[PDB]
Amino acid sequence: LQKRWHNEPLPQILPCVMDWIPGYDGEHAPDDAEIHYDLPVSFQPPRHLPRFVIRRELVVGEDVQVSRETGTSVWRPKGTRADYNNSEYKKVRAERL
Amino acid sequence: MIYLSRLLIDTGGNPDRPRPGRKWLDNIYNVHRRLSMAFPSGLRREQDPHFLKPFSPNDFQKTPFLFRVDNNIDGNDKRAIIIVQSVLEPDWDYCFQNALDFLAAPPETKEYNPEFKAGQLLRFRLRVNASVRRHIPEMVQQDGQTIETGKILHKRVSLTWDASSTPDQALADWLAAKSPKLGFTLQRCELLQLGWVYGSKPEPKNVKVKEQGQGYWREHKYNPLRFRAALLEGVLEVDDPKLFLKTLSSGIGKAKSFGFGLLS
């Protein structure tokens, strides 16, 4: 699971929308599964079929986790400063001297 | 063609403020450099009047010339005097155009031409080196146990005069004997100043190399140079007014660049 900036609020519960699994033939849907009408049998013009949708939940930590962010979104134009000598100021001062 | 003139420099009076002329007078290599970038050229004169360009001595005219730094009192003020003369016209409006702190009063150009014929009593001082090539450059005395290792080296060492006299009748004998060569004579000579003069000259070298061209990458080096000084005067009688003018155009001794020049 991604993260855009470092100090960002993160949803600790991730809602899951899942279809209906017929575990055995003749299974009836649980009495919390709302019907969504997103199932096309043709496309143009739109004719549709309904489907069963089961709510599900996911808290972070057991299988899902945050990802590495990096990628600094702060520009602030770069510029070095304050170099007395690493090894190449002693030798380069004399050239124009 | 005498172009005798003066350059009265600004000695300070506070060794807490920076003093440019006083520091400049302590190094005769830079003294010669300062006196020599004057009358620079007409090659790039029409380009810039502001003396803001990368320096290169090749653009400057390589005419040998002379100067001498001395001290005098006019009537009420000590001020060190620099006397110069050259075959080219004076144009000190560019050598000091951004270093006006080097100067005290604006410089003045005079016109003078000599005439002495023979045997008058109206002559002046002189500056020279006491430089002689050594009779016995003894085999390079080395160090470690105060020993002698080397073979020979012809060096222009200082003049080793006698040990039972003083140099106001030893160097006096020296230039009295030297005078009939250069076309004059000395009836009296008393020295005023003697000693050493020091300087420093930089040597460009080359050790490192560059990966895409020739060896631009390179280091610095300095070397010292020393000379023996003699400032003295005399009431002199010129032998002939036909060969002494060459001596008045070259000077007794030819340090030239390093101070010791002609009779003044």
Side-chain angles (χ1 to χ4, degrees), chain A residues 1-20 22-67 69-90 92-97, chain B residues 2-138 140-241 243-264:
Chain A
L1 169 131
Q2 319 178 168
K3 223 189 172 202
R4 298 113 70 191
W5 59 116
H6 293 333
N7 322 50
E8 146 166 6
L10 198 296
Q12 48 55 22
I13 169 76
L14 304 184
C16 317
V17 168
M18 307 218 338
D19 249 359
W20 188 19
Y24 49 56
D25 277 24
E27 157 80 9
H28 280 344
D31 310 4
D32 47 349
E34 196 32 281
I35 305 195
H36 285 30
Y37 311 73
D38 12 279
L39 241 191
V41 82
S42 156
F43 219 119
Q44 273 326 72
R47 215 64 263 177
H48 266 226
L49 330 179
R51 79 170 190 154
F52 255 113
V53 152
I54 312 167
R55 285 330 147 190
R56 220 42 76 81
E57 273 67 36
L58 250 181
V59 58
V60 316
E62 67 272 20
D63 198 26
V64 80
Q65 67 278 303
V66 316
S67 171
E69 320 100 86
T70 78
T72 174
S73 47
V74 152
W75 179 41
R76 310 320 65 71
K78 62 267 208 192
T80 342
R81 89 283 169 278
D83 203 300
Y84 271 2
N85 162 48
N86 44 28
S87 195
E88 217 91 52
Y89 205 75
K90 287 316 174 131
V92 89
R93 137 192 290 191
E95 207 273 322
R96 292 206 53 93
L97 255 288
Chain B
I2 272 181
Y3 270 177
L4 189 182
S5 60
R6 233 146 62 185
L7 252 61
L8 273 305
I9 45 56
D10 174 64
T11 290
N14 213 322
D16 178 33
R17 315 295 187 255
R19 307 178 284 156
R22 166 84 204 82
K23 184 209 127 156
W24 154 71
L25 261 188
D26 249 350
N27 187 13
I28 55 176
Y29 185 80
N30 273 111
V31 158
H32 177 49
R33 277 221 33 80
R34 158 82 47 249
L35 274 284
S36 47
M37 75 261 279
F39 43 90
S41 106
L43 192 141
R44 81 305 155 291
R45 178 26 36 201
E46 221 74 270
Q47 312 192 319
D48 61 277
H50 290 318
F51 202 6
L52 288 212
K53 58 114 154 194
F55 162 71
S56 266
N58 292 1
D59 321 329
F60 299 89
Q61 189 181 145
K62 269 149 299 313
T63 318
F65 73 113
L66 249 68
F67 28 88
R68 178 185 76 209
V69 33
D70 200 337
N71 304 276
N72 90 9
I73 329 183
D74 299 358
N76 207 4
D77 36 357
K78 149 171 301 178
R79 223 180 309 101
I81 43 164
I82 289 194
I83 274 75
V84 324
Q85 67 280 58
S86 194
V87 310
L88 283 105
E89 81 106 30
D91 201 70
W92 331 282
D93 90 354
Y94 167 80
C95 185
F96 291 71
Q97 71 103 65
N98 41 16
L100 284 307
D101 274 289
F102 278 60
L103 211 29
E108 53 276 57
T109 285
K110 264 198 152 151
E111 191 31 74
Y112 181 51
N113 260 352
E115 163 42 33
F116 276 95
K117 64 63 199 163
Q120 325 168 350
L121 294 324
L122 207 69
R123 218 157 209 214
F124 30 86
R125 300 163 142 201
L126 177 281
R127 260 274 198 94
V128 83
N129 337 33
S131 203
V132 290
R133 281 137 172 210
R134 186 71 267 179
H135 285 335
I136 25 69
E138 50 86 22
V140 195
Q141 30 181 25
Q142 265 279 300
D143 38 6
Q145 301 80 237
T146 76
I147 40 58
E148 168 262 288
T149 73
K151 25 166 209 57
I152 203 70
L153 200 266
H154 287 184
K155 225 158 91 144
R156 239 167 147 179
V157 317
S158 41
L159 173 57
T160 306
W161 30 279
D162 79 279
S164 20
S165 330
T166 81
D168 42 332
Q169 60 305 8
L171 215 50
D173 160 1
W174 195 61
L175 65 181
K178 277 163 55 113
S179 30
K181 163 23 174 155
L182 277 280
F184 72 113
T185 187
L186 290 101
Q187 76 205 157
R188 257 174 69 96
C189 149
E190 302 73 11
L191 57 58
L192 304 197
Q193 192 153 63
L194 90 165
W196 299 77
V197 58
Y198 316 90
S200 102
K201 169 173 60 23
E203 297 317 288
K205 329 309 316 313
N206 180 27
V207 162
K208 265 67 55 170
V209 299
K210 187 76 189 49
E211 42 267 53
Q212 48 75 35
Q214 70 56 15
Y216 332 111
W217 248 112
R218 108 296 164 271
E219 66 271 308
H220 59 351
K221 202 170 319 324
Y222 291 83
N223 70 102
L225 46 55
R226 347 297 289 290
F227 313 95
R228 220 283 193 293
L231 178 132
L232 72 186
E233 58 97 13
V235 267
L236 323 178
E237 298 84 63
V238 47
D239 297 356
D240 64 90
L243 81 78
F244 99 107
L245 198 135
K246 191 172 54 59
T247 89
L248 259 304
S249 179
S250 53
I252 291 57
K254 291 146 268 138
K256 303 186 164 131
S257 33
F258 299 98
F260 314 124
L262 77 75
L263 291 131
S264 152

